Design a protein around this ligand. Structure first.
Ligand SMILES: CC1CCN(C(=N)N)CC1
Ligand SMILES: CC1CCN(C(=N)N)CC1
Length: 330
């Protein structure tokens, strides 16, 4: 089997991407944030505290003939920005882009933090990291990809995120029309439950490439590119007026700037992130200070190749017995 679904930025800055997902019988379509950095499929629901729902589409298990309470199971998750959600669990039929999994754990939110409430465009998350990170207790649950894998033509999914445009998530096949040149594959460590790999270095603009190992994760659920302070300082030093602002919480730059590109290494290959991809616009409406798309990972404990990086590539998440990651230009 295979599946193919379009993923769409939630706003003009590509702050996140949503993908329609069918849950239950008859289908209830919710727009979920596919997140290769977590492993819970959770949704706004009829059980979500009413004051914490503001425009989201909800899953109502009582209206699904295939929903079953997973008795006793609860979940609770916190994300990197301090946001969180928790609730109980149903199993139900879940389809993405024509690919169907029966008996998928659908984590129904009883509580969500303010950031989630305040974003009416995201109806939940669909985690695509390794199932060892799944938070369901007392019986840990599998991701949609883990459940689908045996039925897939090939045990892979691909992320093809657009810059200020829609893109595609494919399951079970590699679309050889979706990228240019060849795909370079690189080793993955699953020790922390992430798609963790080691980049071979970087360049800033037309500068010389610096060979240096940068361990990090391929994370569709993070907006920006978070790298070591040394690397990030070298980037922003090439932009007149750029500075790290503690009041804003990162590097900002004059909105009048033309940003340089940023290149990262994948083996002997190179992925170039155009300068424009690194512009996240005014820090507040009407400001002439703009927020940078490359930020230090110093306060995080891991480097994160988030959407800024991933949307410059066609990315293969290979869930074979020995997992790997593939990157191609496009
Ligand atoms: C850390 C915080 C959680 N992450 C995530 N859900 N994408 C991964 C990075
Ligand atoms: C919408 C959610 C995506 C995952 N998160 C994160 N990387 N910190 C939390 C917000």
């Amino acid at each position: 089997s295979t599946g193919s679904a379009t993923t769409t930025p939630i706003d003009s800055l590509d702050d996140a991407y949503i993908t329609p997902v069918q849950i239950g019988t008859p289908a209830q379509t919710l727009n979920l944030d596919f997140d290769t950095g977590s492993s819970d499929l959770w949704v706004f629901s009829s059980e979500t505290t009413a004051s914490e729902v503001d425009g989201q589409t909800i899953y109502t298990p009582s209206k699904s003939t295939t929903a079953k309470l997973l008795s006793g199971a609860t979940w609770s998750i916190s994300y990197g920005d301090g946001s969180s959600s928790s609730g109980d669990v149903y199993t139900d039929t879940v389809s993405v882009g024509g690919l169907t999994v029966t008996g998928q754990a659908v984590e129904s939110a009883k509580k969500v933090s303010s950031s989630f409430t305040e974003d009416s465009t995201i109806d939940g998350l669909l985690g695509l990291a390794f199932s060892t990170l799944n938070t369901v207790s007392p019986t840990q649950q599998k991701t949609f990809f883990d459940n689908a894998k045996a039925s897939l033509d090939s045990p892979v999914f691909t992320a093809d995120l657009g810059y200020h445009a829609p893109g595609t998530y494919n399951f079970g096949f590699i679309d050889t029309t979706a990228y240019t040149g060849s795909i370079t594959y690189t080793a993955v460590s699953t020790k922390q439950g992430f798609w963790e790999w080691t980049s071979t270095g970087y360049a800033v603009g037309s500068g010389t490439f610096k060979s240096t190992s940068i361990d990090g994760i391929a994370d569709t659920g993070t907006t920006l590119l978070y790298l070591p302070a040394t690397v990030v300082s070298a980037y922003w030093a090439q932009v007149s007026g750029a500075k790290s602002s503690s009041s804003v919480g990162g590097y900002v730059f004059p909105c009048s700037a033309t940003l340089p590109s940023f290149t990262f290494g994948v083996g002997s290959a190179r992925i170039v992130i155009p300068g424009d991809y690194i512009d996240f616009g005014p820090i507040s409406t009407g400001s002439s200070s703009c927020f940078g798309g490359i930020q230090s990972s110093a306060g995080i404990g891991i480097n994160i190749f988030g959407d800024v990086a991933l949307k410059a590539a066609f990315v293969v998440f290979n869930g074979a017995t020995t997992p790997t990651l593939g990157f191609a230009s496009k």
